[PDB]
Amino acid sequence: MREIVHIQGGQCGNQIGAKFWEVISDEHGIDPTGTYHGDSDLQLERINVYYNEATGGRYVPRAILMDLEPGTMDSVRAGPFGQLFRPDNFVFGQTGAGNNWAKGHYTEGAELIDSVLDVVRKEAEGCDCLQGFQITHSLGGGTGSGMGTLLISKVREEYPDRIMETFSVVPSPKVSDTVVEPYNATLSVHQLVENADECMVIDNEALYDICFRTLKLTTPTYGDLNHLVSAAMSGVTCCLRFPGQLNSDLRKLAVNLIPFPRLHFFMIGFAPLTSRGSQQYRALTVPELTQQMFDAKNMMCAADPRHGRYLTASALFRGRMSTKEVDEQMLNVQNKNSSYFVEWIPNNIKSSICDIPPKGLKMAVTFVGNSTAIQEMFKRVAEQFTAMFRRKAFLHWYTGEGMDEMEFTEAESNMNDLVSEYQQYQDATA
Template structure:
């Protein structure tokens, strides 16, 4: 079988991960003790992807639970599915990190990482044909962000040919726990960009909006948010766990969704999302479901897909649905919304159908989109980061307590700016091709105006962004005479020069 090893790091990662195991255990007919009580052979056909069959017919999750303090582990053990997990796979410290990314990545996390990797090796060795790793964590926390990214880099070194897929909860200013979340998220994104093949972005702000506006919950709890996330994760992994027509493993999903290695930040979604009061009065049709799945209100990320373009997308339908009707509706959506789909990737919306429905629904659909609008989320985090970093607020916790260099903040900011520019350039590439297709032979923008409009938007914007950042750090260097500011200014000027050469 093509097995997947699941890892959950930090308090948020463990809460989401545990809820995910509850949902898929129910779908596969596995009770809280690991015994199968299902009624369909399809439940067992590919169960070895996520479960290992132990002695006595007990099914044990291929899961590793990690935290730097014991409290979360105690909560998981005390929960209804606490006895489902292998006791040796609980790996935890005693000190905690106090929401400091540097402690999770460089000090306390580094002390625990060898013990974690030993458990990872044992799980990997028990697989017949390991296809990859799945990680749930939060980017705003010290353990989830700091140790989670350390774990991805170590696994990338040890298993370079295996896929790493993450479900990463992105911090939001509207739903915040700690003031240093922008620092933690910015530092985490750099490692996710380098070491993972798929990052499913989940935004607390979007989850709260869904609970308030769509589900009509007046006081949503973290259990409500975790239920939304676990339902989405269950749908995305459906094609790994049950027989399907397309996207049968992590690598196929990557090939279909990721056109360039660094552009692997995906927007998940789910439909139908209706309040419990109105759910029993609605009989959903495929056209309604397809319309909902592309709606911004059904996305788990707080950005509007209409502000960008879909490079690629995948829609996974569950229940008794007609393949022909699905294909017709997807084609209809693309034809009606041509400006919102990339025109240089043909057949860029993939569909998959699983006959086994989600509990309580006759039909449902999960969505995974690679849309350039996700750069708005990155810009939001970057702006919050810059506002604090410019004043060096809360920075003393990181070098002194975490043992990291301030230069790492500058490199993380540079990596984020590069990522934003890449998404911008791929949005502009579509616009340029449209201009060429209409027969425009000149190099100026059709709207005319000032001289800047004659340049390619992506290269121009990135060049000026780099110059502005370089000037900012050069001015700071003149004031405080710090070496890292000189280095940062030089790095941005070099990036501007590279951008000019390739323009």
């Protein structure tokens, strides 16, 4: 009961899923054939949260897979745990977008929406009770970011009363991947912010920062990035699947991290994260948990969290540990950085506990905090967006499929409307 379904978009959305079920599969004890081989009874009591029931006793993830080209889609199935997805669920086109957001928002993405929305509706309806959707895509792809959001807006117009979790990746300035990134990344923020409830941001630049600074391995591959991101996702729903002292559903985390409907941005991070060297050099004690939780280098988001001031945050411990230290240890952090906390919001940390910890360690914690420092990511991207527009460079693509320049201007103000409006509360005083 109180379950949600999953929807992904694009190669980055496709690839990220490949491990999320891989990471989820080991903890839930699902073998790659879909048969149960678990060792604990509770490993099946709440199994309905992410698996349905069918003939033969084998379970299948209730995911929706959707793409505009066949290379990525066919690729996933052959990977580990890649056979879990059902065949009927897949729906794909035959055109190809190629980072042209306008291509992915009006013509190619919209045309095929009929099935993708249809495959969405069937899955949700059959449940006993829907809880919401979790969305993971990337704003760096016109087909993805464009057709990624277009599905997003329609979902809201069909179901207003359900929460909607959002995951994605945005391009950092120093590390660049596409010269046409700013246009599609920033536009999608316009539609998302008008509909997205919970935050969606995670920065790759800090993703690799954690890759070498903490993990200290020599040459990471795309395997590492998928591993760290998925585990964090498992943290969001950790207590929603197993018993705990004070469970923390999405809404409860939703209920305690959104000061206002529009300021819906969070930065996520995972701890503890140590390399083979300190696996048994370090001691897993509560002082380590907090100490590595609020520091920047563990924060996977590019925004520096020490150049702003927190408005509120909450934590989700995993594993069994006496609560007391959970109470005061969070209390100490809330003062010893006295200035680091905005003044008008008293008692701005939310806490919870989970008893069954993710495999690989006896205890873990996930960070979810809405830090006004996020403005840096927009401003750095915001600066780029305006620059590429004045010279009328690359305006030919998007204007060739029914999109006018009036819309671009509006998005320009709104985002700057957000940044201008976001900074006001940071210095707010009572």
